[PDB]
Each structure stands twice: as C-alpha cells, then as structure tokens.
Amino acid sequence: PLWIRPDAPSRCTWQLGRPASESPHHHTAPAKSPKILPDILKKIGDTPMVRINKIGKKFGLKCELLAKCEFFNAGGSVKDRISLRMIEDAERDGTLKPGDTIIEPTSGNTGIGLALAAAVRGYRCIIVMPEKMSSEKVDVLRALGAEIVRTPTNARFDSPESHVGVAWRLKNEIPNSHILDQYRNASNPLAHYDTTADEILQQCDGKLDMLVASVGTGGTITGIARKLKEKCPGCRIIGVDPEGSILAEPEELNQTEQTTYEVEGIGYDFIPTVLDRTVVDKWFKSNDEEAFTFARMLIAQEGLLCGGSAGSTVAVAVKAAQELQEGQRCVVILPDSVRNYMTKFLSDRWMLQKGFLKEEDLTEKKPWWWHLRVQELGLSAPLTVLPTITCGHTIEILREKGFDQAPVVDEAGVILGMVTLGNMLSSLLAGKVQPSDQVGKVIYKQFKQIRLTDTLGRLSHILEMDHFALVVHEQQRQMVFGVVTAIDLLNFVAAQERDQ
Amino acid sequence: PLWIRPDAPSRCTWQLGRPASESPHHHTAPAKSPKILPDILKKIGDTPMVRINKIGKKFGLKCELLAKCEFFNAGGSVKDRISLRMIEDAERDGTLKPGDTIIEPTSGNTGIGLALAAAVRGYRCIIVMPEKMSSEKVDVLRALGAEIVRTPTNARFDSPESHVGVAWRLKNEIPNSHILDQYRNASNPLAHYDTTADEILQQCDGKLDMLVASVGTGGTITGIARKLKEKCPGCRIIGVDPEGSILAEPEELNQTEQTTYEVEGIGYDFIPTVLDRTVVDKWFKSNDEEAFTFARMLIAQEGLLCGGSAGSTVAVAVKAAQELQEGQRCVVILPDSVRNYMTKFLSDRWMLQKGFLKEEDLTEKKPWWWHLRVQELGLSAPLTVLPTITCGHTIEILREKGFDQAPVVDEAGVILGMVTLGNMLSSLLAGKVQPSDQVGKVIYKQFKQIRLTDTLGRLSHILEMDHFALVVHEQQRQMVFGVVTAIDLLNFVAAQERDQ
Ligand code: HEM
Ligand code: HEM
Ligand SMILES: Cc1ncc(COP(=O)(O)O)c(CNOCC(=O)O)c1O
Ligand SMILES: *Cc1c(COP(=O)(O)O)cnc(C)c1O
C-alpha cells in the first residue's frame, strides 16, 4: 500500500432504525473516574454544559441556549476525545505496539491531543500541520515533545505536499510508524457517538430541540447526530461550514468568490470518509468576520475562553435557532480554547491588520476623551536629576523642591528612568539602600516616551503596559514636559465630567 | 485613611484545637452542581487530583506524588475560587451592589478571575498589575473587559506606586468602587479552607502525608493547612517561596542578593494579613531556573499544561518528599495554566535570552546530524520557471524534464514561490484553473531561504514553520542550489542510519 485517500466513500452500513447489536464496532461505555486519576488522559470527557445568558437574548432567541464547553479537556479541545480513542482502539487492535511512532495530518488540535497522549504513554509523535495554523499550536506541540512538519495552506488534499499526502510519505520512510488517520478512522465519530452524545443526553435529561456544530473531519457532528437521531429524533442537526469549504449541502451554498480563510479547524476541500452528511438536517455557511466577532463576544459577555470555530458555531446558532420557541432548547459545541489564538483574533492589532474590525466604525463605542491630546492634561514640568545622585541627596532635593518624583537624565540627555520620594524613603527605611548609594536599585527603568501631540487613547493603551508615560520634546530629548500615569488620566476624566 | 496596609497583623483568633462552632465567619459547604451550569462561574472547583508517574520516580521519590490541578477552573487558575468567593460574600453582606466597581491589586490570576466574574455579573473591573506580569494576562484581561493599570516591579509595597498603593488611590477617585483585597479578605483563605481542602481530603480518603504549596497571598496554604491540621494532623505543610521574597521562615533562608525574579504569582516584600505562617511546617526557597525546568518537565513528561509556580512547587516537592517512604503520599498544588506564559518559559528563545537554558544543555541531547551542513544533503539544482508560465506549460515542462516541482523566479532573479506537478494537476482537474491561465492562483508563495552553510538543526527548526526551504547564494541574484522539505531530511537521516 502507498496511500489511502481521506475522502473514499464510507463502507458503513449504519441506518437509522437498525439496532446496536448489529454494529461490528467496539463501543466503550463511559466509565466512573476514580478519586485520583492515574494520569491526565482521564481528564478528557465529561465537559460542562453551560447556559448562554446574554448572547441569545441579544440576538432575539426565545429558547434556552446551552454551550458544551470542550475546551476544558486536558489538551484544551474536543479532539482530545478522538486522540485518546484512536490510540486506545489501535492498542487493543494490536496495530499500535509500545514505543511505536504516531504520525498524524492535523489542523492542530488532534495533533496536540495525540502529542499529549504520546508524551504520557511513551510514543514517538510526528505532526503534519498546514502553514496557516497558529504558532501557539506549534509552541504546545514542541513542549509536548512532538516533531513538527508543515505543508502549504493552499495545497490541494490529493497533491503530494498536502498535510495528508506528506503524512503518508513520512510513514513510508519510518519503520514502526502508524497513521491513525482521523479522516477515515471510525474511532473518531465513535468517540462522539459513545461519549460526547451520551453526555449531552445525560445533561439535557434527554430533552433537546436543536444541536449546532461546526464541521472539520465531521466526526463530532456525525457521532452526535447518529446517536441523537436514535435517542432524540426531534432534535434538529445544524452543520456549520466556512465560506471556502465544500462540506455543506446543497452544493449551491459553496459557490463563493474566495478560497482561503483565517478560522482554524473547520472546512475542507474534500468530504472526509467519517462525515455522514445524510444525518445533517441543515447547513449554514460562516465567515471569518462573524466567527471572530462572536468568539470575542463569548469571552466578553459569557466569560467563555473559547476559540475561533466556537464563534462560528454561536454566530450560526443565533440565526438557526430563531424558529425555536420559549421552553425549547438549543445546544452548541464549543470546540477549543483561546490559548491557540493569543496572537491571532485575541489581538486587536491582528484583527485590524486582517480587516475584521473597521477602525473608523469602532470609534463609535470610544470615550469622549479618546481623541483629545496629551498636552490638554495640564502637565507639570518635572525636576530632573543626574544618575550620579545619591539616595540621600535624592530625598533632600525632592523634599526641598517640593516634588514627589524626578526623571533621571544623564549628561548626554538620555532619559534613564524615574526615582520617587516614596520609594526612595521606603527603600532607605527598610535598609535596602544606604544614603550614600547611587540610585541603581531604586530607579524605575521602564517607561514609554510620548509626544505632546499624541492622543489620550494612545496614552490609555500605553498605560496597560507601563506605569508612566514621559512627555518629551521632539528636538530636545533631555527635555521632559511632564510625567503621566493612570491616576493623572483618571483625575482629568473625572474632573471634566463632574461639572458638565 | 486613604489605605489599609496589606501586611497589618491578623486579628483572627483561630488557634488549632478551637471547634468550628466558634468561628465567626460564614462557611460554605461544597454541594453537588447541576447538570446544566447556570453560568461559567459554577465551573470553579472540583478540580482533578492526578498521579505524577515519571517525575517523582526520576528524582528517587518512594511515595506516591499527586497533583491538585487548579488550572482546570473557568479562568485557568486556583484564583478563580477566591475571586468568586470574595464577590459572593461581598454581595451577601451588602457591600457590593449591582453595577458597582471592583478594583484589585493583582499579579494577574486574581484579576482574571475577578474580570471573568465581573463580565458575567455586570460589574466594572479595574486591575492594577506589576509591570513584570506576562502580556498573555493583559490580553485575557482586555478580552474580558477589564481596565488595566500597571505598576513598577521594583516598587516597594508601601510606596504610592505599588500595585496595592495605586489600587487604593484609584478607589478614592471612583465613586461606588470597592477593593475586595485578597491580602486581607478572609474570603481568600476561607475559600480554600471550605472547598479546596475538603476536595483534597475527599480525593485522598483523608489520608495524605505531605502537602506542598507555593505562596503568594498565602490564602491557599493557610486555608488548606488550617483544615488539614484539623482533619489530617499528621500531614506536613511545606511552603514554597521564591529567592527574592521574604515570606519564608526562618529569616535566614531569605538572605539573598537580588529581590527580582521571573516566576509569577509567588513571593512578596511583605507578609500578607491572610498568611498564617504558624501552620507551615517547613519552607523551601525556589529559584527561576528550577521552576521553568520543572514546568517544562511537567508538560513534557506528564502532559500537565501548567504554569511557572507549578514548576516551583514540584521542584521543591522532589526534595521535601525524600523523607517519605513507599506507601506514603505527597500532594502538590499546581496553581495556573501554560496559557499565561506562551511567549515566556514556553519559548526556547525566551529561556535562552534569560539564561535559563544554555547552548551546552541545548546540545548533547541533539541527534548526530544536528551540526551537519545543508550542503551535506547532496542537493540537486532545480529547474526554475518564469511567473508568466501557463498552468498547462508547467505540467508539460515538469513531466518532460522529469521534475515534480519548480521554484518560480522572475527575470530580475526574485524568487516568487514554488509550483508542483501534483497541485497544478489537481487544480486543473477540479476546475480551479484553466490551461491557459498564469500560475498566480496555484503558486505556493510561502517559503524560507536557507544557506548551504547553515546546519541541519537550523533546517529542522525552519521546517517547523515552513514546508519549503530554498537553498540560495548570498553573492549571486538569489540563485537556487536546491529545494529541501522535511521528507528530504528524513531521507538523508534514514539512508545514513542504514549505512551506520
Ligand atoms: C450499529 C450500526 C452500524 C453498522 C451495522 C455499521 C457497519 C459498518 C461496516 C460493515 C463497516 C465496514 C467495515 C469497517 O470499516 O469496519 C463500517 C465502517 C465504518 N463505520 Fe460503522 N456501522 C455502524 C455504526 C457506526 C457508527 C455509529 C459510526 C459512527 C461513529 C460508524 C462509523 C464508521 C466509519 C467511520 C467506518 C469506516 C468506513 C471505511 O472504512 O470506509 N459506524 N461500519
Ligand atoms: C477557630 C475559629 C476562628 C475564630 C474564632 C476566628 C475569629 C476571627 C475574628 C474574631 C476575626 C476578626 C474579624 C471578624 O470578626 O470578621 C477574624 C478574622 C480573620 N479570620 Fe477568622 N477565625 C476563625 C477561623 C478562621 C479560618 C478557618 C480562617 C481561614 C483559613 C480564618 C481567616 C481569617 C482572616 C484572614 C481574618 C482577617 C484578619 C483581620 O481582620 O485583620 N479564620 N477571625
Ligand atoms: C477548533 C476546531 N473546531 C472544530 C473542529 C471540527 O470538529 P470535527 O472535525 O469533529 O467536525 C475542529 C477539528 N479539526 O480537525 C481535527 C484537528 O483538530 O486536527 C477543531 O480543531
Ligand atoms: C496567587 C498565585 C499563587 C499563590 O497562591 P496564594 O493563594 O496567593 O498563596 C501561586 N501561583 C500562581 C500562578 C498564583 O498567581
């Protein structure tokens, strides 16, 4: 054998109405976890179901909206369930022997799950991931001891250089290596059929009207839907597919004028073998802008520290569940954590750079003082001192001159930092410094320079990283107009709105 | 007025032996949580107790070593317990009213917990955090809607510029604002006494011989130790304090040169009111190098995606628990998650820059091929094509000349990217491009240039971010000597390993 296509038609003869006895598959029943877990892999599953309290109401939902929070799994994603299940079944099968090598083509989360289990169980782990996936995924994979290979983001799945193609190529060169293959492996949807779906039914007391889930491999939606069609046939199954992907039906939904997208984990250029599209009642297409808008809303309004595809899911859910009435219930799957996207959608700079926040239209929720300039604060000219000054002479000069702080500026005009009366006194009284010592241990070295013409909004951002902003002269660096801290900005804002 | 010292002596009349009936505090009994959580704040507590299987044995421990994993709480840390309890108690005692302002001096984790609860409950949240704390904490705080103020890392606690001093100064300027004050609030150690400690006892069947906990506010170790001294008196309480802090006893342990350190959340320049050192049996001084070495070891060997102070705790535990025999049990508290330190200890560049990792220890464990040069791969000079070539002509020339890929190089010598036979054919068969089209839609624009003199170790790092490495000449107009992928390095290593 050279390669097995990830989109080959499924040979599963499952049909709704067919009893469980007829299944050729091994089904693992959820097991009572002991008081002390023997390893972290037992902390995969039994994820919380949390009511959404603000977002549903905001978008006019009448029904109850609940979120299945899969980011609480050991590795931080829903994929920890399939990572563990694929390994356990392969071990039981005799396929995976001790110390063997696991190679897996992944968008990140299956790779993390497999790398975590490989770290614990003692397997060599090689992950093949497209170039677009976050550096935070790489960082965690490296820490877990996984070897990482990258493939071009725009490589077609059936090309030699796709993540799938490269994984098979590496397996062919490494003896004792296996590709568990999440795109074809029944252990993927069966993990969701046996556990994720059983948890949802248990948590809902078997009463559920709608399920919304984003689609990558299709294991989550397939596993959950097959079980729900058997146990709760009245539950409508809603699939979420990004614009650029071809998973959605009817095919008319996939005719778009763009092929790439920023959201990670969902959508493909092929139909994975594990995806059963017949069990999905309706599909909705999502875009990056609404996915990141909703992910940021989930964090800001619900405190759910989830990722991009979780935003895509809730963005669809508020449209899809509009038809539900009071008393009815909609469940959404939140697949992964914000950890994977710290420097991506979590960053306003990244959102702006990608055009997902219109800066001009963002200024509508910005305070009245945001666009005012630094000079309007009424800056007090500060006294400056040389770095050669003693701790004792610093106390003398600040008290003699009536200042509580002083920037330290050398003979060449370089601003070295700040010294305060309070800190110098506290350090002296605690014996940290002697009066004759130089100010080296007491000086506050970190500060940001700002112009008289900079905005107060710029100042506000600066004050989230530094304690003080030093207002300088563009033509005389040694010349400091003022020292501004968060307290000065508050005093200004408060005084202005205590008289108008 | 204006401020109450966070180190004022405790007025608590608790003493070991006093019946719980004499406590004047409110005590919450942990109760079963509902199937569906009304909000994410209910996902605080009931944290896992996980057996440490490799690290303990590696350092010669005979006892069982267990980890109480607090990073599974809603906000990612142990502090989510105290954030919720401080708010709940303040609401119940009438001090905190709907829509009031919460201001808190924090190292980050209490701020995250409070910001999460404030986002859910609808309170304005202002965090005052030292400059050393990670930018990852700032990014999560921003996403939750908290306002962020920073203070100098080297500001003495009693100076006006400390995180506690600034929080009080802000409160005095904001009407209807409150400082819950984790340094003096009984709700901090009470959260641990009522819930964390009872969980540890439930999980251990009331039988454990040693508890190791790192110390910041002291709420965790004080709450747990007061309950453990009452219900498991044989348990040894071990406190972990970083070098640079003054919390440890005897004072002789604290006679260190420096007072600054990279580990976050532990150690202080004052004794917090909530810290009861009389219930700590022994202190150990930890350092940054061992804290990060152990946090990386916990990830790599145990799959525990924890933070820096978790590493400090386990670094001490493998020393403190040496006195225990086979059959005894040591429990460590792992306070937060790796999410807060993505670009800090998780990064090898940061570790190198800080001196916690040396090129010597970085090498040794490196494979035999690591220091070989790219030139030793035995590169083949590739066929290059112009960017004006058609998709049809690309198929023809690659097949005709016997190549599977070609760099695209313009007449000025600029490398635009790569084209492949496989991707071009798949694109054509799927109707993405027409034979007469130029290759703009198929070209792989992302690649990394490498030199013939660079090492295979450098190539390996490059291959964790890019699929293609193009070997070039610094003197000629970017003339390509060869194209390398992860398959090409594996082919070189595997063939040479057969000869060896
Ligand atoms: C109880 C009813 C079911 C029957 C009678 C059935 C039957 C089969 C048969 C005959 C095969 C081909 C042999 C093989 O690959 O093992 C198969 C494959 C498979 N089954 Fe099932 N199955 C059932 C339920 C399920 C469920 C609930 C899932 C979802 C989690 C599932 C997922 C799969 C997958 C993904 C394959 C792989 C297809 C391939 O290799 O092309 N099956 N099934
Ligand atoms: C034997 C039982 C206890 C007695 C008689 C006791 C008594 C007191 C009293 C009289 C106060 C003064 C303020 C107030 O009444 O609210 C107090 C404060 C305090 N208690 Fe309790 N307490 C007991 C147990 C605990 C426990 C189990 C903890 C948690 C580990 C705790 C932590 C504190 C703290 C941190 C303070 C703040 C000290 C201050 O007000 O400056 N106490 N306690
Ligand atoms: C963030 C995220 N959301 C959503 C999903 C979609 O889940 P499913 O593939 O089960 O439909 C995934 C799964 N991506 O494909 C496997 C992988 O992580 O390597 C995902 O990672
Ligand atoms: C606060 C904190 C600690 C110390 O716990 P306390 O309850 O404050 O003693 C340890 N680790 C981290 C990361 C924390 O932020």
What is the DSSP secondary-structure string of A358-423? -HHHHGGGS-TTTTSBGGGG-PPPPP-B-TT-BHHHHHHHHHHHT-SEEEEE-TT--EEEEEEHHH
**A430 plus A317 within the same structural domain:** no
Q: To which H or E segment does residue B204 belong?
A: none
Residues in CB range of B287: below 8 A, 6 or more apart: B242, B243, B261
Residue type, A87: I
| Paired tokens of B85 | 């309890």
Cis, bond preceding B250 (omega within 30 deg of 0): yes
DSSP code at position A432: S
In which residue are the tokens 């293609």 written?
B468
Look up residue B375 and give its two tokens. 């030139």
Q: What is the CATH number of the domain that holds B145?
A: 3.40.50.1100
Instruction: Report the distance separating Cα B97 and Cα B100, nearest Å.
Output: 6
Residue B447 lies in a domain: yes
For chain A, helix, strand, coil in percent to 5 are: 40, 20, 45
Distance CA A297, CA A376 (A): 34
Which chain A residues are within 8 Å of B346, Cβ to Cβ? Answer: 139-140, 143
- Give the side-chain half-sphere CA count within 13 A for A185: 23
Chain A residues with CB-CB distance to B205 below 8 A? 35
The set of residues, in sequence order, having a beta carbon less than 8 Å from that of B109 and lying 6+ positions away, is: B75, B76, B77, B78, B79, B80, B137, B265, B335, B336, B340
Q: Residue B195 and residue B208: Cα distance in Å, rounded? A: 17
Q: Please check whether residues A415 and A447 belong to one and the same domain.
A: yes
Question: Which amino acid is residue B468, in one-letter code?
Answer: F
Measure the CA–CA gap between A122 and B53, rounded to whole angstroms.
12
Is B362's Cβ below 8 Å from some Cβ in A?
no
Identify whether the C-beta of residue A410 lies closer than 8 Å to the C-beta of residue A387: yes
**For chain B, how many structural domains are there in total?**
3
The Cα A245–Cα A213 span in angstroms is 15
Q: Which residues pair with B480 in a beta bridge?
A: B472
Q: How was this structure determined?
A: X-ray
Residues A368, A268: Cα–Cα separation, whole Å: 45
The residues facing B408 across adjacent strands are B385, B417
Residue B323: both structure tokens together: 């006195």
Hey, what amino acid is at A132? K
Closest by alpha carbon to A321, among A236, A200, A205, A241? A236
Q: Are B335 and B220 in contact (CB under 8 A)?
A: yes
Residues A286 and A382 in one domain: no
Helix (H) or strand (E) holding A351: helix A348-353
- Three-state SS at A315: helix
Number of alpha carbons in the 13 Å side-chain half-sphere of residue A153: 19
Q: Does the annotation list A265 as a binding residue? A: no
Instruction: Please check whether residue A329 touches B, CB under 8 A.
Output: no
Q: Do B482 and B385 have their domain in common?
A: yes
Indicate whether B165 belongs to any domain: yes
Reduced to 3 states (helix: H, G, I; strand: E, B; else coil), residue B212 is strand
Do A139 and A127 contact (CB within 8 A), yes or no?
A: no
Which ligand has an atom closest to residue B93 CA?
2
Q: Could you tell me if A303 and A329 are in contact, meaning their C-beta atoms sit under 8 angstroms apart?
A: no
Q: Specify the resolution in Å.
A: 2.7
Residues B214, B309, single domain; the answer is yes
Residues of A in contact with B425 (CB under 8 A): 159
Shared-domain flag, residues A493 and A440: yes
The answer to whether position A23 is within a domain reads no
- Both A469 and A369 in a single domain? yes
Count of CB atoms within 10 A of residue B296's CB? 19
Tally of helices (H runs) and strands (E runs) in chain B = 16, 15
Which atom of ligand 3 is nearest to A340's Cα? 1
Q: Residue B33 contacts by C-beta under 8 Å, 6 or more apart in sequence?
A: B42, B46
Distance between CA atoms of A460 and B217, rounded to whole angstroms? 29
Strand-pairing partners, residue B337, are: B306
Characterize the bridge pairing of strands B124-130 and B101-105.
Answer: parallel
The residue type of B355 is: G
Among candidates B314, B342, B308, which has minimal Cα distance to B77? Answer: B308
The answer to whether A463 contacts B75, with C-beta atoms less than 8 Å apart, is no
3-state SS, residue B87: helix
Q: Do A64 and A207 belong together in one domain?
A: yes
Cβ-defined contact of A43 to B48 (cutoff 8 Å): yes
CB A448: neighbour CB atoms within 10 A? 16
Closest chain B CA to residue A138: B464
Q: Does A497 touch chain B (CB under 8 A)?
A: no
Give the CA count within 13 Å in the CB-facing half-sphere of A240: 30
**Which listed residue (A35, A68, A79, A97) is catalytic?**
A79
Cα Rg of chain A (Å, integer): 29
CATH number, domain with residue A432:
3.10.580.10
Count of CB atoms within 10 A of residue B251's CB? 8
CB burial of B111-147 (b: ≥16 within 10 Å; e: otherwise) equals: bbbbbbbbbbbebbbbbbbbbbbbebbbbbbbbbbbb
Q: Which of B7, B39, B403, B459 to mutate to test the interface with A (most CBs of A within 10 A)?
A: B39
Give me the amino acid identity at B190.
L
- Give alpha helix (H) positions in B216-282: 219-231
How many beta-carbon pairs below 8 A join chains A and B? Answer: 276
B309 marked ligand binding residue: yes
**B236-242 and B448-451 beta bridge pairing:** unpaired
Amino acid letter for position A446: Q
Strand partners, A67: A50, A332
Query: What's the Cα-to-Cα distance from B277 to each of A307, B232, B255, rounded to whole Å?
Result: 41, 18, 18
Ligand-binding annotation for A12, yes or no, is: yes
Rounded Cα–Cα distance for residues B419 and B422 (Å)? 9
- C-alpha A378, offset from chain centre: 42
Question: Apex CA B289: angle with CA B135 and CA B162, to 5°?
Answer: 45
Range of the domain at A268: 39-75+190-357
Does the beta carbon of A338 lie under 8 angstroms from any beta carbon of chain B?
yes
- Tokens 């001096």 correspond to B105
The burial of A341, by beta-carbon neighbours within 10 Å (0-12 exposed, 13-18 middle, 19 or more buried), is given as: buried
A252 to chain B, any CB pair closer than 8 A? The answer is no
Asked if B283 and B253 count as a contact pair (C-beta separation under 8 A), the reply is yes
Angle at A145 between CA A143 and CA A151, to 5 degrees: 95
Give helix then strand counts, H and E, for chain A.
16, 15
Residue of A nearest to B428 (CA): A156
Residues B117 and B242 in one domain: no
Q: Are residues A246 and A386 in the same domain?
A: no
Phi, then psi, of A166 in degrees rounded to 5: -70, -35
Strand partners, A64: A329
Residue finishing a domain among A357, A377, A405: A357
CA-based nearest residue to B492, from B316, B369, B359, B348: B369
- The answer to whether A150 touches A126, Cβ cutoff 8 Å, is no
Same domain? For B157 and B272 the reply is: no
CA–CA dist A414, A384 (Å, integer): 11
Interface of A with B in 403-462 (CB under 8 A): 404, 420, 422-423, 425-427, 430, 432, 441-442, 444, 446
Give B336's DSSP letter: B
In angstroms, the CA A257 to CA B51 distance is: 52
Q: Is A19 helix (H, G, I), strand (E, B) or coil?
A: coil
Beta bridge mates, A168 = none
CA distance linking residue B117 with residue B39, whole number of Å: 10
Which of A148, A154, A201 is best to mutate for the B interface (most B CBs within 10 A)? A154
Rounded CA-CA distance B438/B126 in Å is 56
CB of A227 closer than 8 Å to CB of A95: no
Distance B351 CA to ligand 4 centre (A): 22
At A314 the three-state DSSP class reads helix
Look up residue B256 and give its amino acid.
T
Q: Which residue among B145, B300, B339 sits closest to A300, beta carbon to beta carbon?
A: B145
Phi and psi at residue A231, to the nearest 5°: -90, -25
Ligand in nearest proximity to the CA of B267: 4
Whether the Cβ atoms of residue A399 and residue A422 lie closer than 8 Å to each other: no
